[PDB]
Amino acid sequence: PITGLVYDQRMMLHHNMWDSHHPELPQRISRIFSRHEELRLLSRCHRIPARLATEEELALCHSSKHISIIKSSEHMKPRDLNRLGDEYNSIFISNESYTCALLAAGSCFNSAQAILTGQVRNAVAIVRPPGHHAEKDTACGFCFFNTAALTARYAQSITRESLRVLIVDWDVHHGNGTQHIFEEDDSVLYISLHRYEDGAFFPNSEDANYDKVGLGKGRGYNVNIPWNGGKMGDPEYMAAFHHLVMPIAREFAPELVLVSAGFDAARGDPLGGFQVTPEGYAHLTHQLMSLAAGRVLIILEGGYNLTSISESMSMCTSMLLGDSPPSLDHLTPLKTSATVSINNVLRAHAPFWSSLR
Numbered sequence: 001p002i003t004g005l006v007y008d009q010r011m012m013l014h015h016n017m018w019d020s021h022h023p024e025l026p027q028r029i030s031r032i033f034s035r036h037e038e039l040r041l042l043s044r045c046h047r048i049p050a051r052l053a054t055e056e057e058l059a060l061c062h063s064s065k066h067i068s069i070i071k072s073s074e075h076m077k078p079r080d081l082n083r084l085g086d087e088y089n090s091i092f093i094s095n096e097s098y099t100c101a102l103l104a105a106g107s108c109f110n111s112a113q114a115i116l117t118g119q120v121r122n123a124v125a126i127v128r129p130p131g132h133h134a135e136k137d138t139a140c141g142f143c144f145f146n147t148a149a150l151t152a153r154y155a156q157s158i159t160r161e162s163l164r165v166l167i168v169d170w171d172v173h174h175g176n177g178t179q180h181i182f183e184e185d186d187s188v189l190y191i192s193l194h195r196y197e198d199g200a201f202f203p204n205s206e207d208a209n210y211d212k213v214g215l216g217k218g219r220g221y222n223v224n225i226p227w228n229g230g231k232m233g234d235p236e237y238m239a240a241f242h243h244l245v246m247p248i249a250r251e252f253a254p255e256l257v258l259v260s261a262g263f264d265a266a267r268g269d270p271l272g273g274f275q276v277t278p279e280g281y282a283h284l285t286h287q288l289m290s291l292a293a294g295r296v297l298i299i300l301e302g303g304y305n306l307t308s309i310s311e312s313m314s315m316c317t318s319m320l321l322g323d324s325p326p327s328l329d330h331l332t333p334l335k336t337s338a339t340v341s342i343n344n345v346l347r348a349h350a351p352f353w354s355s356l357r
């Protein structure tokens with residue numbers, strides 16, 4: 001009946017040498033951690049230590065070339081750090097970035113291990129830099145290594161190769177890297193909700209559309225729920241969970257749930273444009289706790305309003321600890337385009353999931 005928590009201030013050391021106001025700030029994690037103290041949640045959790053992922057562990061999802069290049073940045077001079085970062089889509093690199101990315105991944109490995117050994121029931125990981133845009137062979141979108149994807153493979157490496165892992169990605173952006181890593185895999189079900197705007201929203205690829213259902217034996221195991229033309233919030237996320245996420249997840253019957261928990265869909269975010277409330281995130285967390293014998297690991301991804309992410313993630317930890325879940329209005333009408341999105345995903349995935357037929 002225990003909730004784990006991992007946070008290590010060393011992950012603040014990754015920083016933008018050329019724009020100290022870049023939104024992926026060191027204080028994202030320290031603000032969330034401080035809010036857990038203010039709300040007296042920290043002392044209710046079992047503290048799980050951070051550790052470095054090993055290069056062998058990184059190779060569970062990433063190419064040797066990509067690992068080597070990011071590793072090479074540890075000792076680079078500033079001009080070379082600037083040039084390397086510019087080779088990617090939306091990446092800044094400091095001499096601490098590689099080690100911080102290793103700590104983010106290793107923290108989540110230790111948390112998954114604590115869950116799978118039964119030392120804790122569930123856990124929260126207050127880590128940065130984020131991971132879900134990172135691909136097998138490249139960094140992208142503030143992300144170096146795909147922490148959630150690596151954690152799924154790490155869990156499989158200690159319990160069972162075919163362990164059924166559900167990754168729910170509620171960051172406002174599509175986790176292109178996670179989708180691609182598992183696109184042909186039926187042991188890892190990837191479900192993403194994300195702003196799409198017909199491809200106008202970052203990362204600006206049709207890979208995020210509802211018709212990308214997976215490949216080969218992975219067909220049906222990639223669920224994209226894309227939002228267009230509306231300021232989405234609690235009603236739309238609750239509806240997507242009710243009609244799509246939970247029916248599919250229950251049929252898949254995961255043995256471990258990882259949440260790619262960005263908080264950039266939150267009210268107040270400078271980028272997301274959405275209005276999911278802390279109660280909304282608590283509702284989603286509580287729903288996921290009904291799966292996988294409660295084995296849920298919440299992993300910080302994006303989210304850029306420091307006050308919003310601190311309150312939102314803290315409310316998720318409150319749910320993991322067993323606090324009473326919020327009651328929300330399931331009768332509020334959805335934005336009209338959200339109904340269209342949900343119907344498009346249902347049509348795309350009904351061939352693969354009997355719960356949708």
Ligand SMILES: O=C(NO)c1ccc(CN(Cc2nnnn2Cc2ccccc2)C(=O)c2ccccc2C(F)(F)F)cc1
Binds near residue numbers: 022303
């Ligand atoms: O959260 C996240 N992943 O989970 C996440 C990951 C990466 C970005 C990067 N990015 C893309 C972006 N987003 N909103 N417009 N564009 C630019 C665009 C213009 C015209 C057509 C298409 C795209 C930045 O543009 C960017 C780059 C450096 C510093 C600050 C920013 C910010 F977004 F804040 F302004 C954003 C979010």
Ligand SMILES: [K+]
Binds near residue numbers: 171172192194
């Ligand atoms: K997402």
Ligand SMILES: [K+]
Binds near residue numbers: 182188221222
């Ligand atoms: K998959």
Ligand SMILES: [Zn+2]
Binds near residue numbers: 171172262264302303
């Ligand atoms: Zn995001």
